[PDB]
């Protein structure tokens, strides 16, 4: 699809931390 934002989400490697939320 577009390797546009899959670049940005590994600088926000911190949505994994998101487990936390449930």
Partial sequence: ???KWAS???WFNITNWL???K
């Fill in 8 to 10: 940005l989400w590994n």
């Fill in 19 to 21: 487990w936390y939320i």
């Fill in 1 to 3: 699809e577009l390797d």
